[PDB]
Each structure stands twice: as C-alpha cells, then as structure tokens.
C-alpha cells in the first residue's frame, strides 16, 4: 500500500482482469481493427470465441492486421466461411492466405483476402500509426510475482502493438516461455483483460530433408567464417547447415527467426555472442517457431533476448556486427541473379523484404556475407529451379544479391556483368538444363 496502490496490487488487478474468452472478445466493435501476435502466440481461446462470435453474426467488418499465419487463426478466425465478416487484412502471405485466395479465385475470382503491402521491418509503426489498431490479442507466460507476464516467444511488432492498442487481451499459457528482451515483459497494469489457456504451443512441422541438402549444407558452412554473427530462416536446410557448424566457436546470433537449429548451437556452447558488438553475450531474435523440446529451452533462458522488429531488421543495426551470416532459401534463380522466394498467385501479392534487410545488412556487415540458396531443380529432377528470367516482381532484387548456391557450387554476384552473372549461374543449374539455360541467355542477349 501507500502511493501508487493501484500498480501494487497485482493479486486484485488479476481478479479484476481475470475472465472468460467469451466475455473478453464480446465487447470488440464491429468496424474496428484488430491485430494479434505472430504464429505462436496467436491465442487460440480468445481467436476460438472471436470467431464464434462472428458465426452467430454478433459482430462484422471486423479488420484483422497481422502477419506469419498458424493453423490457429486458419481454423478460427481466418476460416473461408467467415471471410465477409472478419476481413483477413494480411501483411505478409502464407499458407494459410494462399488457401484462401484459391478459394476465392474458384468462387469467380472472389477477393477474399485484403493483401496489405508492406515492409516487415516498418510493421511496428504501420501498425501503431498508419493503420491503427484497437484491440491487440496475444498469448504470454504466466505472471511473475513482481507482476510482469512475457511476450514469450514474440516481440516483433508485437511490444509496440501492446501498448499503442486501446484494449489488450492476454491468453496466459503455462507453456509459453518466460522471455527476456525489449520490452517483452508486460506488467499487469498495461494489461485490459486476462483469459488463462494452457495447451502445448504450435509446432513448426519438421520437414523430411532431400538428398541436395547435404551438398548445399557444405558449401554453405564453408563460407561462414570465424566469428560469424548468425541469421538463418527456417526448414530442414537451416538446421542442417546448423549441424555442420557443431564444431564451431565463438558464434553470434541476430536472426530474424530463431529456429531449432540456431538454438541446438546454443545449447551446444557453440553460439557465445562475444564478438557481437550489439547485445553482446545474448542471441537476438524478433519472434521464434519450433517445437516443443525449443519452446522449454526458451523458458528463463539468461542468454537469449528479444528485440523489436525495427531493431531487428534495420539492416543499420545488422551491419554494426562484424563478420554477419545471412542464410535464405529461396525457389527459384534466374540468370540475372534475381531470386523469388514466393509460391505462384500472381502479381497481386508481392514479398514483405524480411529476407532483404538481411541481404542488405549482411552485405554491409565488415567481413560479412549473405547467402541465398536452392536446390538446383524440383519434382525428381524434371524441373530447372534456375530459369531464364523471372516473372512478376522478385523477393531478392538482382542488384542485392550477393552469394548465390546451390548443390553445384558457390558464387559472389557483385560487381559481375550480365553476361558473367549468366555464364555462372548455368553452372550452378543441373547438367539437364545447362544448354537450354545457355540457349536462353543468348536468345535474351544475356550472353
């Protein structure tokens, strides 16, 4: 007791907040705009009662402003059925929206979800300022007993929306983390309402890996020096690139995504974060995916820190550490060096540049390297992942590539012409391919 009472309580504040997801969600206006954490940490109780409210028509035009979609808000509030009532306004296209855009196209070209351009690295403020949003949704560890729940595995844009949102509804998970970093702890003062849900978080699936892999992992790992600060995507190509960095020392991490892979260094004592001049002695990341064996290692980890997503992906702030790894898949290459990274809808739906800030940073990084990698072909060898030119917009534009690989070998783009950019980027496709890619680049003039 005594001056400022209100902030001490936290046992009274947790009873007053304290509530079920139906009467949490009930007093969303229709109109208004939502926004929620980042796959994770998408609350499955409150999204399972928001979308129940929408089903029963209790509420409409409801926006929802979010990115890196989970199974949880597809099979709730994001379903198809739903999609006149709650508008998907999606920043960054996953699975989930390409399902429903494919539903859409079927129903005579139906628009069904409302694609936001964006870049990821500007999310915080898109959110908070140009957009706005009312309500923010977020699942968190539970509270402390100085009052203080976490963001667990987001902060993201996540730490900004929290605030900046008129009203924010908390799903406490046991199962969720406690995490440390910016402002990734919440003290139960800034919190408008409690529901408490624990259940296993969502798991990335682990993905069977193809034979390329092996080669490509090598290669890789070759071109990561001593010292290297960290930034690698997700999938079974990362967490084997992971593997043959087991034997390593002295590693950073400042990654966009933490993944298993990145975490195994960790545990391993391979990743110190001593030569990081940013957050030294901590591996930074803005949200993580994995799964479950990762989520508890998370938990009160002292050596691992989240950093908001403007932090994170400033490529300013990636280059300040020295001797920086950016490691990206991609789907396709063409002969002028651009990648595309995004499954086939067409022009509409364009890439966020998450991948790019670190392309840029890693560039930038002094001694540092980014690395966009593929196998060379798909569907048993019938198709050339290396083509002439790509169509529609590209995710790594042709003047930012830097290292390019695949299971035939490594090449630094920079400061090559066309010409040479062509010649070695026919030698990295599969033998199969080689002389209708060169056909091509003459017909093109490329050659």
């Not at 009472?5 to 705009?33: C, N, Q, W």
Request: proline share 5%; with cysteine; aromatic share 6%.
């Amino acid at each position: 007791m005594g001056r400022g009472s209100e902030f001490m309580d936290i046992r009274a504040l947790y009873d007053e907040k304290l509530t079920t997801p139906e009467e949490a969600v009930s007093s969303i206006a229709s109109g208004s705009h939502l926004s929620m954490g980042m796959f994770a940490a998408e609350p499955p109780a409150l999204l399972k009662a928001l979308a129940d409210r929408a089903t029963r028509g209790d509420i409409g035009d409801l926006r929802v402003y979010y990115m890196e979609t989970a199974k949880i808000a597809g099979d709730t509030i994001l379903r198809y059925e739903l999609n006149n009532r709650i508008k998907p306004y999606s920043m960054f296209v996953t699975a989930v929206e390409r399902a429903l855009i494919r539903r859409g196209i079927e129903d005579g070209g139906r628009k069904v979800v409302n694609y936001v351009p964006s870049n990821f690295h500007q999310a915080p403020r898109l959110l908070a300022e140009e957009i706005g949003i009312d309500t923010f949704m977020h699942t968190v560890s539970p509270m402390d007993c100085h009052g203080y729940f976490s963001l667990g595995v987001g902060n993201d844009y996540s730490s900004r929306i929290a605030r900046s949102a008129r009203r924010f509804i908390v799903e406490v998970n046991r199962y969720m983390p406690r995490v440390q970093g910016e402002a990734a702890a919440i003290h139960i003062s800034e919190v408008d309402a409690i529901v408490e849900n624990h259940v296993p978080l969502i798991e990335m699936p682990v993905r069977s890996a193809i034979p390329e892999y092996t080669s490509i992992s090598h290669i890789i790992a070759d071109l990561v020096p001593d010292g290297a600060c960290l930034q690698m995507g997700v999938g079974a190509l990362p967490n084997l690139v992971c593997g043959v960095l087991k034997d390593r020392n002295d590693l950073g991490i400042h990654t966009e995504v933490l993944n298993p892979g990145l975490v195994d260094l960790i545990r391993r004592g391979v990743v110190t974060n001593q030569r990081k001049t940013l957050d030294r002695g901590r591996s930074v990341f803005t949200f993580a995916m994995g799964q479950q064996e990762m989520y508890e290692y998370l938990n009160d980890h002292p050596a691992i820190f989240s950093r908001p997503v403007d932090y994170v992906n400033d490529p300013h702030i990636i280059a300040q550490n020295d001797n920086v790894v950016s490691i990206n898949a991609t789907l396709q290459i063409d002969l002028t060096g651009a990648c595309n990274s995004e499954h086939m809808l067409g022009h509409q739906y364009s890439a966020s540049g998450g991948q790019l800030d670190f392309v840029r940073g890693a560039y930038a990084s002094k001694g540092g390297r980014s690395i966009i990698a593929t196998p060379s072909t798909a569907a048993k060898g019938t198709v050339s992942r290396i083509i002439p030119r790509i169509d529609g917009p590209v995710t790594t534009p042709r003047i930012d590539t830097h290292y390019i690989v695949t299971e035939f070998g490594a090449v630094n783009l920079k400061g090559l012409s066309s010409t040479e950019r062509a010649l070695r980027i026919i030698e990295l496709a599969h033998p199969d391919f080689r002389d209708e890619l060169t056909q091509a680049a003459k017909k093109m003039h490329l050659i």
